[PDB]
Amino acid sequence: GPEEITADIPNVGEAALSKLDESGIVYIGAEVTGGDILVGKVTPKGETQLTPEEKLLRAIFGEKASDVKDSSLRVPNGVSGTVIDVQVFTRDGVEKDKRA
Amino acid sequence: FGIDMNTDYTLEEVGKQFDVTRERIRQIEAKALRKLRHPSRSEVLRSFLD
Amino acid sequence: FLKPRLVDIEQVSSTHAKVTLEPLERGFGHTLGNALRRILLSSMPGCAVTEVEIDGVLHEYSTKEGVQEDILEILLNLKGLAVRVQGKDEVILTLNKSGIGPVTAADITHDGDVEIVKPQHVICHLTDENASISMRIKVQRGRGYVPASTRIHSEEDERPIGRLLVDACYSPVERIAYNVEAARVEQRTDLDKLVIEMETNGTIDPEEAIRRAATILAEQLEAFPEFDPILLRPVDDLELTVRSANCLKAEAIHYIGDLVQRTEVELLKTPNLGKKSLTEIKDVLASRGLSLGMRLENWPPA
Amino acid sequence: TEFLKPRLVDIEQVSSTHAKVTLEPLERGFGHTLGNALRRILLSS
Amino acid sequence: GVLKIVKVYLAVKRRIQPGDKMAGRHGNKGVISKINPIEDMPYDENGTPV
Amino acid sequence: SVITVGPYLRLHQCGLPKKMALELFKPFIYGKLELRGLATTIKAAKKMVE
């Protein structure tokens, strides 16, 4: 399937989703360090094919395992700076997202 | 589940192997997971979830 | 065993002065003097500006229309602004100005403990007739050098992205030099003088600095596991709605441990919690393997 | 703006007339001023 | 194959730390070893450190 | 990495950067961390040093 830039990221706290706008792109002027999510990205991977202990774990804790893997662009480990610019390129004919 | 065992067994199959079958078994599991739900049991497994 | 003391303090400028010490025994001018130089340069109270929120600025790397200075230049200029406070450890000031012309340090609003030593000091210039800049200059007090980079660990929601952190320049002292000349007091074999000529920004009095220096110097001579961690996380980690969080905090529920003790009955009896909020709380708690009416018996240990 | 005092002494002495004493934490640059001002006083006076 | 691209531009500010390489124009290289306090710095009779 | 002096060192030792040593000994750190009981499991150890 097609990948999404959406701000909806499987398995992240509000601290993680804080630095992203509704569309999933980090705000201009927001100071970041390694591990912060700059651009939320998600790619389809279906039927994760788990194992018995994992199946027990999920049924105990009642967690739906997402069909989407987290490809999001995050600040490289160790580098810390302030975002001064954001540019979005879209294929001619694909609908521009909110942020764009 | 399939824990330390080949494949896994339907609730009815588990019922045949337990001689006490059907809805009965479905209840035990529900109360079993429940016992594992509350902490001091669940705190070890909880950290596995990121 | 004569102990020293001070004598005429000669102030030649708002900037710097020469403090002098009469009664000094053989070789003690150096021992006292250099040691005093050390503490003087190193450890001293300072009030250097820390946080600055400007008008339309998200980051220090932009340029504001109407001012020829880059924002980073303006921060660097502010870092060199010398102020002295009395009763407040941290004060926040407000700078405002417009029209064509230089914006000095006297253009800020004057507060109770605010004393500007250099009113002529240039923060930034103004190039256009109608162009205006407002800013909050958050000035706090500290010792030594505290760079802006080490300032973020604690974090704790510095979210107002318009707030640019700046490196802490805390220290009155610029240059300290000590010269010992033989000092002849009326009657005595041979004694030395201590001429400490120091350089300041004016935010600290010579007697005060020289005092605290030896104060600290002598001051050094003074010796010469069960349960879930998740239970102690703040309620904000549950990521509830603002309403629910505020309601819980209003009911003295600040942590998850406090919440899991409460029952549905008790929560519904609160003045501000409806069925929707309770549904949300039960949902988010169940989503992490928790619930209401959970007993942990022993709240709290230490 | 409170200060720092040491908190982990351990005087390790050889024989009797000889001694090696150590002081654990101390603010940056305080070790040299203390060590020196003291050496000066110990030797010269 | 690529639907959309998001380019974020970071501005990082680094000052100086041990391990950095410094040199004059005369072919004299060097690497900063330790960062010394102003206190320990060699100073002239004027009191100005180096 | 780039190297510096450290004259204070004894002949038998060398100054090793904190971050480097952390990343290098990562499995050892995990193992010791869950050896003393500071970490519930290896995952928790990873999350801790991370």
PDB file of all heavy atoms in Angstrom, chain C residues 38-50:
ATOM      1  N   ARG C  38      41.581  33.522  42.427  1.00  0.00           N
ATOM      2  CA  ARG C  38      40.895  32.321  41.977  1.00  0.00           C
ATOM      3  C   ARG C  38      39.399  32.348  42.249  1.00  0.00           C
ATOM      4  O   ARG C  38      38.585  32.266  41.331  1.00  0.00           O
ATOM      5  CB  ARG C  38      41.477  31.112  42.692  1.00  0.00           C
ATOM      6  CG  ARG C  38      40.632  29.863  42.553  1.00  0.00           C
ATOM      7  CD  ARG C  38      40.865  29.269  41.203  1.00  0.00           C
ATOM      8  NE  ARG C  38      42.263  29.445  40.844  1.00  0.00           N
ATOM      9  CZ  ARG C  38      43.202  28.544  41.076  1.00  0.00           C
ATOM     10  NH1 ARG C  38      42.883  27.392  41.639  1.00  0.00           N
ATOM     11  NH2 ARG C  38      44.452  28.795  40.730  1.00  0.00           N
ATOM     12  N   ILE C  39      39.048  32.486  43.522  1.00  0.00           N
ATOM     13  CA  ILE C  39      37.654  32.486  43.935  1.00  0.00           C
ATOM     14  C   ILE C  39      36.945  33.680  43.297  1.00  0.00           C
ATOM     15  O   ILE C  39      35.793  33.572  42.871  1.00  0.00           O
ATOM     16  CB  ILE C  39      37.513  32.485  45.480  1.00  0.00           C
ATOM     17  CG1 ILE C  39      38.367  31.365  46.102  1.00  0.00           C
ATOM     18  CG2 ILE C  39      36.042  32.399  45.896  1.00  0.00           C
ATOM     19  CD1 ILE C  39      38.196  29.976  45.466  1.00  0.00           C
ATOM     20  N   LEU C  40      37.641  34.814  43.231  1.00  0.00           N
ATOM     21  CA  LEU C  40      37.097  36.011  42.590  1.00  0.00           C
ATOM     22  C   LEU C  40      36.681  35.771  41.141  1.00  0.00           C
ATOM     23  O   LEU C  40      35.575  36.112  40.748  1.00  0.00           O
ATOM     24  CB  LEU C  40      38.107  37.155  42.646  1.00  0.00           C
ATOM     25  CG  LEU C  40      37.931  38.146  43.798  1.00  0.00           C
ATOM     26  CD1 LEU C  40      39.074  39.143  43.832  1.00  0.00           C
ATOM     27  CD2 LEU C  40      36.594  38.864  43.664  1.00  0.00           C
ATOM     28  N   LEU C  41      37.561  35.166  40.352  1.00  0.00           N
ATOM     29  CA  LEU C  41      37.256  34.912  38.950  1.00  0.00           C
ATOM     30  C   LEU C  41      36.166  33.847  38.842  1.00  0.00           C
ATOM     31  O   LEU C  41      35.213  33.997  38.075  1.00  0.00           O
ATOM     32  CB  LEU C  41      38.515  34.521  38.167  1.00  0.00           C
ATOM     33  CG  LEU C  41      39.450  35.706  37.882  1.00  0.00           C
ATOM     34  CD1 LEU C  41      40.718  35.284  37.149  1.00  0.00           C
ATOM     35  CD2 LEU C  41      38.713  36.783  37.098  1.00  0.00           C
ATOM     36  N   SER C  42      36.308  32.778  39.619  1.00  0.00           N
ATOM     37  CA  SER C  42      35.447  31.606  39.493  1.00  0.00           C
ATOM     38  C   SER C  42      34.046  31.742  40.084  1.00  0.00           C
ATOM     39  O   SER C  42      33.049  31.706  39.362  1.00  0.00           O
ATOM     40  CB  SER C  42      36.119  30.396  40.148  1.00  0.00           C
ATOM     41  OG  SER C  42      36.132  30.527  41.561  1.00  0.00           O
ATOM     42  N   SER C  43      33.975  31.964  41.389  1.00  0.00           N
ATOM     43  CA  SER C  43      32.698  31.877  42.079  1.00  0.00           C
ATOM     44  C   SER C  43      32.280  33.225  42.614  1.00  0.00           C
ATOM     45  O   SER C  43      32.910  33.780  43.513  1.00  0.00           O
ATOM     46  CB  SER C  43      32.772  30.858  43.216  1.00  0.00           C
ATOM     47  OG  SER C  43      33.337  29.639  42.769  1.00  0.00           O
ATOM     48  N   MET C  44      31.185  33.716  42.042  1.00  0.00           N
ATOM     49  CA  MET C  44      30.605  35.017  42.330  1.00  0.00           C
ATOM     50  C   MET C  44      29.164  35.033  41.835  1.00  0.00           C
ATOM     51  O   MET C  44      28.852  34.435  40.798  1.00  0.00           O
ATOM     52  CB  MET C  44      31.375  36.127  41.614  1.00  0.00           C
ATOM     53  CG  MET C  44      32.795  36.402  42.094  1.00  0.00           C
ATOM     54  SD  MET C  44      32.911  36.874  43.833  1.00  0.00           S
ATOM     55  CE  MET C  44      31.729  38.214  43.881  1.00  0.00           C
ATOM     56  N   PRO C  45      28.277  35.726  42.566  1.00  0.00           N
ATOM     57  CA  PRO C  45      26.870  35.818  42.156  1.00  0.00           C
ATOM     58  C   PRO C  45      26.767  36.596  40.849  1.00  0.00           C
ATOM     59  O   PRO C  45      27.514  37.551  40.659  1.00  0.00           O
ATOM     60  CB  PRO C  45      26.218  36.621  43.296  1.00  0.00           C
ATOM     61  CG  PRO C  45      27.188  36.535  44.441  1.00  0.00           C
ATOM     62  CD  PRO C  45      28.543  36.450  43.817  1.00  0.00           C
ATOM     63  N   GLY C  46      25.864  36.199  39.960  1.00  0.00           N
ATOM     64  CA  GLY C  46      25.677  36.932  38.720  1.00  0.00           C
ATOM     65  C   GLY C  46      24.230  36.873  38.296  1.00  0.00           C
ATOM     66  O   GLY C  46      23.544  35.926  38.649  1.00  0.00           O
ATOM     67  N   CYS C  47      23.782  37.838  37.499  1.00  0.00           N
ATOM     68  CA  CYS C  47      22.365  37.958  37.168  1.00  0.00           C
ATOM     69  C   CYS C  47      22.058  37.844  35.674  1.00  0.00           C
ATOM     70  O   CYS C  47      20.923  38.058  35.264  1.00  0.00           O
ATOM     71  CB  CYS C  47      21.841  39.300  37.680  1.00  0.00           C
ATOM     72  SG  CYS C  47      22.851  40.026  39.007  1.00  0.00           S
ATOM     73  N   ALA C  48      23.075  37.531  34.875  1.00  0.00           N
ATOM     74  CA  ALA C  48      22.969  37.416  33.415  1.00  0.00           C
ATOM     75  C   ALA C  48      21.633  36.879  32.872  1.00  0.00           C
ATOM     76  O   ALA C  48      21.118  35.870  33.353  1.00  0.00           O
ATOM     77  CB  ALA C  48      24.133  36.572  32.883  1.00  0.00           C
ATOM     78  N   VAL C  49      21.098  37.568  31.864  1.00  0.00           N
ATOM     79  CA  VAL C  49      19.844  37.216  31.190  1.00  0.00           C
ATOM     80  C   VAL C  49      19.820  35.769  30.678  1.00  0.00           C
ATOM     81  O   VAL C  49      20.770  35.325  30.029  1.00  0.00           O
ATOM     82  CB  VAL C  49      19.602  38.158  29.999  1.00  0.00           C
ATOM     83  CG1 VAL C  49      20.878  38.272  29.192  1.00  0.00           C
ATOM     84  CG2 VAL C  49      18.459  37.654  29.132  1.00  0.00           C
ATOM     85  N   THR C  50      18.757  35.022  30.971  1.00  0.00           N
ATOM     86  CA  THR C  50      18.651  33.659  30.439  1.00  0.00           C
ATOM     87  C   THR C  50      17.691  33.421  29.268  1.00  0.00           C
ATOM     88  O   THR C  50      18.106  33.031  28.176  1.00  0.00           O
ATOM     89  CB  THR C  50      18.290  32.659  31.543  1.00  0.00           C
ATOM     90  OG1 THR C  50      19.321  32.647  32.537  1.00  0.00           O
ATOM     91  CG2 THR C  50      18.163  31.273  30.955  1.00  0.00           C
TER      92      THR C  50
END
